[PDB]
Symmetry: C2
Subunit: 225 residues, 2 copies
Amino acid sequence: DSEEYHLPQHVAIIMDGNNRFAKKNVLDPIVEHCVKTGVRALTVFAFSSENWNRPQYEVDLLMKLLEETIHEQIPRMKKFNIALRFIGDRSRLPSHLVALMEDAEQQTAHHEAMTLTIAVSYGGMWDIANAAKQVAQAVSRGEIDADQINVDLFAKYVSLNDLPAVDLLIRTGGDFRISNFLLWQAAYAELYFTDTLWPEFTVEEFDHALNVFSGRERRFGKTSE
Amino acid sequence: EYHLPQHVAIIMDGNKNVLDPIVEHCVKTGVRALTVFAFSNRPQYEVDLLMKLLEETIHEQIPRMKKFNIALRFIGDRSRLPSHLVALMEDAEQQTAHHEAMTLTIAVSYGGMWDIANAAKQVAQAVSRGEIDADQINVDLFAKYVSLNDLPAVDLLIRTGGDFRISNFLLWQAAYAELYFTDTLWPEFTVEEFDHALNVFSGRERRFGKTSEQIQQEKIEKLLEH
């Protein structure tokens, strides 16, 4: 405990609003600011560019863009001691994209002050059902008694179970939905919604959100989680 | 045009009956489901008082449910509830089951994580019996074990009391819900503010679109109304 310290250990961001933007990288200064300030985990969802329910030509372009962006980010993540991680379904992804994700995770694992997780082909319901599948597979092997399955056991199989629970979730762009993102992990997260469009989102407003989180922790306490 | 939610959820938090005008507004506007959670590990005497209050409230509400053609439902863990409360819940559900205009669900000893892990337990028990291959488990199969799966997904979730958390309520069911937060404490929550929240919901659906499930629900309801 501490009277002065109220920094969230795990921040999640739903990046939205470029679809409404009429007229330099936004995420990079946020990521750098987080690791410099001591945030332990940052988990992000590109609300438009990870929506792969589009014509196959567009999905192909989006995957190529993701690959080029991962490649460009690896040396930057090494420079700032950030571990890159990916969550989501990999079973239907092109082999080159899977290899590139593994490569990026392997190149950035050493000497990591913060984990940056990118949601790729991810959904919160998918995550929960995947955890249930893994639990049932363990039951089939005799490793779990199905009658003893409870919240604490199930939590060990959901994505990001080795990181702190999400303390703060930010969504830009104006909508007030968490849109099937980190449903289990953000069960007790403070939710910060802003109409600022993602391309116009600033480190200053991010700091404001952190101060809002601190004030809400003072006002409503920390939760059970 | 004007967009009404199919399923409203409320976290009643506060740091005359408040819920009754809200229930009546839902019935009058065609809301199909209203699910409520009294937000707040206490001395046993306080737990007993709360249980007795819940029992008396269920008793008081049954005739209103008949009057407005509302079906009563309860979600949450029943394994540690007093047997008299469990029997009263079963009786209320059976007495109101034929009512088909709206479902009012009261969450008692409920948590969203509990709900999800309970679904996982049921699926794994079926696997243990050899009824299901664990490799078949996916979203569509799992969804049938989560509470309220026969009702529309939550479109609008209201939380009173000032905090901006969903606090482990309907995590699966509110995956695409619009979230409406108000500083108003629950005892002071009015049907006028509920009307305002519904108006805000309509504007947000116009600006940010309907969910996919909402669009399919509306297609189906148009096909059926004919």
